[PDB]
Design a protein around this ligand. Structure first.
Ligand SMILES: CCCCCCCC/C=C\CCCCCCCCCCCCCC(=O)N[C@@H](COP(=O)([O-])OCC[N+](C)(C)C)[C@H](O)/C=C\CCCCCCCCCCCCC
Ligand SMILES: *[C@@H]1O[C@H](CO)[C@@H](O[C@@H]2O[C@H](CO)[C@@H](O)[C@H](O)[C@H]2NC(C)=O)[C@H](O)[C@H]1NC(C)=O
Ligand SMILES: *[C@@H]1O[C@H](CO)[C@@H](O[C@@H]2O[C@H](CO)[C@@H](O)[C@H](O)[C@H]2NC(C)=O)[C@H](O)[C@H]1NC(C)=O
Ligand SMILES: *[C@@H]1O[C@H](CO)[C@@H](O)[C@H](O)[C@H]1NC(C)=O
Lengths: 197, 224, 274, 99
């Protein structure tokens, strides 16, 4: 009784149909295969059930491709949403007993294509701490730096997806010259300064 | 806030001690409570299950007896107890059960057990730092971005959301990744408010295991 | 969390010299539009009520609805005269659609008379409701002679409506995904009998509508929980009361548990202590 | 096919004397749409009473929510009065704070 998910990480745009592969090795006549979703906060959520007796099942946007002879249970998610980005797990078990899980496959839903929007650069400060805020930009590729001569610590920038479909970003650091720290952003072959605003 | 319980939790314990792991799951008629362990990069596996009606523990083959114990402090409430904690015991522990007709197997919110015998500071609560919105932002974009930075906390499990004073609405905030600061962790979250809400007082609510007095931390953001 | 677009029309015909038509549009549980008889146009209730329709497209729909309202009132009054139906008459229309992502869309246009289904729009034509009065068959025949109205309704249901639903979902995504935390409190109720208690758990102020409230001892759910109806508040939140009939001794250690999306995985638990 | 209305009265917040609150009267399941709804304080009509738009349910029966702002005290009594063609006579249902 083994479960294997060959794929490790899979990416796909919005409103498409992604497929996760699962292969099981079992000897039971009657059994069940469950597909669960795991969230970044480590929470398991039931998605689909497909036993060895029924035909292929679906529920909402979740469907299952079942082949007993080749022992294949492929999960299909149709019209992906931005909340689909999570780790999907395949499990095998009989009723009222344990589940045998695979290692899981991470699905990352990438935003639809957007027009190239220039970033907007702002700076906020508290003591030595200085953060640079970048409001609206597409594509996600972007470089950010803070003008300083006494940088105590720097941290990797955080890039997130805005509700508009473009990207937000925040870069935080500590500087001894914090009262005169500006921000520079290289995005879309263009340079934007915090002093521009 | 004082009547909220459950959800994702973390328990930090040293080696050669015991750990308690709670179960926020809800049952209709449960004969068994299964305990699952999930370690990073590994498949979730069941360690044991608890016979509720007869109050017994059945452990998976290969596990030494007495390592895991299911305790019933109050009626129909269950806690998993781990003895002789080692570094390998770290991971997310779930409680689970089948539903009434054995359709599906529901899992709990899960608890991250962090077993470390390393020296830590006497205060590993999230230290808060407050960033008022940029003046140019308010003047130009007709909006305002508060920034809530929490640093020097352990372990890395932490929840952040935003609310308004006299309001129970969960505001739409964005947060960065939880990054490592030597032997502790740090996370920041920013909130953009429109021109209609600068005048309101805002709240950065932070849920962490080692918050002072074991209560959710409210960080004030004054109006502008 | 399904978000069907429901356009509802309530037309009352009394005295033959008195009539009114009122309408509203719902997207899920939110009322997005209101259409009063004393106003010439449908009123938007939300900043995003126009969806992704242009200004001209929405005004086109407004002109369509003004003509629809006057023609419906006149056609009903003509129907009342041609057949033997007595005033007052109470016609209701339920029309709308639901959008499956990337697969298919579906719609409906049901008409009720005195609270009972009489006909519906199926495919390209009008069909009478099962077990309908005989005169309705004559009405279907006249409606099916009007191919222009059938074509316009088909255009609206199969083309205009799915785009409107998609635009409303995209444009009002922020309000549809809004989360408002409920507040709960315990209370006493009229005694069911001697030596017994009626434990009451109020939960009010939550949005969206899906909620879970039960009386229970720890993690075990008391199967005797009596959930009431989810009743609306004026600010588009909801209220729900849950009661439990219990021996006074059993009320010790009992708690009311509330699960809601706004809670972020946690539950509100209220123990019987005051 | 006629159906008599179900009427339910409740407050937005828990009743605390002297603190503002909203009194709701939800009338549902009735047919035809002709209805009269009034909120009463000690038997007298409250002037500023608002109502949502008339709607109807899956079963085609109509429903309406009436509400008003109020600050309750210990001696004030509140009730909801409904009149309808299926009722020859107006139903007054009093508001229980301790529901
Ligand atoms: C539909 C969803 C699209 C998006 C919605 C956007 C916003 C919604 C806003 C507000 C909510 C209000 C909703 C109310 C419901 C809306 C329905 C709209 C339909 C539009 C159709 C326009 C065509 C038009 O306007 N049709 C009119 C055209 O009239 P005409 O005379 O110009 O026709 C020429 C032909 N002829 C030979 C001269 C007659 C038509 O006559 C009216 C009404 C008839 C409708 C029939 C309905 C079924 C029969 C019921 C009555 C008889 C049976 C019982 C009798 C006792
Ligand atoms: C910088 O951050 C500090 C905390 O690191 C803020 O100090 C707090 O300010 C609030 C009012 O805003 C007081 O009620 C707290 O008592 C303060 N805490 C401490 C520890 O002093 C400070 O306001 C922030 N300042 C700016 C300009 O952003
Ligand atoms: C509902 O609205 C209609 C108009 O849409 C009102 O009825 C018409 O009102 C005009 C006013 O100039 C008269 O000339 C018409 O004879 C009335 N005719 C028709 C065809 O209905 C009606 O009174 C309104 N009902 C109300 C306000 O209760
Ligand atoms: C864009 O890139 C081109 C070369 O690819 C360069 O000539 C130009 O200056 C760039 N634009 C900037 C730096 O704003």
């Amino acid at each position: 009784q083994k479960v294997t998910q060959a794929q490790s990480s899979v990416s796909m745009p919005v409103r498409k149909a992604v497929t996760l592969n699962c292969l099981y090795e079992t000897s039971w006549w009657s059994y069940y295969i469950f597909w669960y979703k795991q969230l970044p906060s480590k929470e398991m959520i039931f998605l689909i059930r497909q036993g060895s007796d029924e035909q292929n099942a679906k529920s909402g946007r979740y469907s299952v491709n079942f082949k007993k002879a080749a022992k294949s249970v492929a999960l299909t998610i149709s019209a992906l949403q931005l909340e689909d980005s999570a780790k999907y797990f395949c499990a095998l078990g009989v009723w009222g007993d344990k589940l045998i899980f695979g290692k899981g496959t991470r699905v990352t839903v990438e935003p639809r294509s957007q027009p190239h929007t220039k970033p907007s650069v702002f700076v906020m400060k508290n003591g030595t701490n200085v953060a640079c805020l970048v409001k609206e930009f597409y594509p996600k590729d972007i470089r950010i730096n803070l003008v300083s001569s006494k940088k105590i610590t720097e941290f990797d920038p955080a890039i997130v997806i805005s509700p508009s479909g473009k990207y937000n970003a925040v870069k935080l650091g500590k500087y001894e010259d914090s009262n005169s720290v500006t921000c520079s952003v290289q995005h879309d072959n263009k340079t934007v300064h915090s002093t521009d605003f | 806030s004082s009547n909220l319980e459950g959800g994702t939790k973390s328990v930090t314990r040293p080696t050669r001690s015991s750990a308690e792991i709670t179960c926020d799951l809800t049952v209709i008629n449960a004969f068994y409570i299964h305990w699952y362990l999930h370690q990073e990069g590994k498949a979730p596996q069941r360690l044991l299950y608890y016979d509720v009606s007869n109050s017994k523990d059945v452990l998976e083959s290969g596990l030494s007896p007495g390592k895991y114990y299911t305790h019933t402090p109050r009626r129909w409430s269950w806690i998993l107890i781990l003895r002789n904690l080692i570094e390998n015991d770290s991971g997310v522990y779930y409680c689970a059960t089948w539903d009434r007709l054995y359709y599906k197997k529901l899992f709990g919110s899960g608890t991250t057990l962090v077993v470390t015998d390393k020296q830590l500071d006497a205060d590993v609560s999230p230290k808060p730092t407050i960033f008022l919105p940029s003046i140019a932002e308010t003047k130009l974009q007709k909006a305002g971005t508060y920034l809530c930075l929490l640093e020097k906390f352990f372990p890395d499990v932490i929840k952040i959301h935003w609310q308004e004073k006299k309001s129970n609405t969960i505001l739409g905030s964005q947060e960065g990744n939880t990054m490592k600061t030597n032997d502790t962790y740090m996370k920041f979250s920013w909130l953009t408010v429109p021109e209609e809400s600068l005048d309101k007082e805002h709240r950065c609510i932070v849920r962490h295991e080692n918050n002072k007095n074991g209560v959710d931390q409210e960080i004030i953001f004054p109006p502008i | 969390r399904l978000f069907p677009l429901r356009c509802l029309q309530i037309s009352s015909f009394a005295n033959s010299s008195w009539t009114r038509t009122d309408g509203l549009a719902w997207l899920g549980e939110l009322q997005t539009h209101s259409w009063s008889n004393d106003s010439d146009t449908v009123r938007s209730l939300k900043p995003w009520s126009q969806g992704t329709f242009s200004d001209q497209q929405w005004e086109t729909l407004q002109h369509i609805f003004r003509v629809y309202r006057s023609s419906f009132t006149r056609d009903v009054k003509e129907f009342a005269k041609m057949l033997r139906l007595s005033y007052p008459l109470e016609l209701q229309v339920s029309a709308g659609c639901e959008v499956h992502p990337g697969n298919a869309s579906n719609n409906f246009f049901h008409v009720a008379f005195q609270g009972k289904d009489i006909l519906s729009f199926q495919g390209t034509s009008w069909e009478p409701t099962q077990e309908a009065p005989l005169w309705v068959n004559l009405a279907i025949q006249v409606l099916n002679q009007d191919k222009w109205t059938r074509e316009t309704v088909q255009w609206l249901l199969n083309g205009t409506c799915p785009q409107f639903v998609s635009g409303l979902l995209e444009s009002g995504k922020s309000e549809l995904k809004k989360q408002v935390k409920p507040k709960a409190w315990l209370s006493r109720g009229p005694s069911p009998g001697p030596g017994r208690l009626l434990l009451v758990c109020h939960v009010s102020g939550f949005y969206p509508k899906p909620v879970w409230v039960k009386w229970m001892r720890g993690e075990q759910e008391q199967q005797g929980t009596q959930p009431g109806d989810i009743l609306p508040n004026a600010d588009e939140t909801w209220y729900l009361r849950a009661t439990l009939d219990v021996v006074a001794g059993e009320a010790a250690g009992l708690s009311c548990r509330v699960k809601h999306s706004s809670l972020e995985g946690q539950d509100i638990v209220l123990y019987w202590g005051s | 096919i006629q159906r008599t209305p179900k009427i339910q009265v409740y407050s937005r917040h828990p009743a605390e004397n002297g603190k503002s609150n909203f009194l709701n009267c939800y009338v549902s399941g009735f047919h035809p749409s002709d209805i009269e709804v009034d909120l009463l304080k000690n038997g007298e009509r409250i002037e500023k009473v608002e109502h949502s738009d008339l709607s109807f349910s899956k079963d085609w029966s109509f429903y309406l929510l009436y509400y008003t702002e109020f600050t309750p005290t210990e001696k004030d009594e509140y009730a909801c009065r409904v009149n309808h063609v299926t009722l020859s006579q107006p139903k007054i249902v009093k508001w229980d704070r301790d529901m």
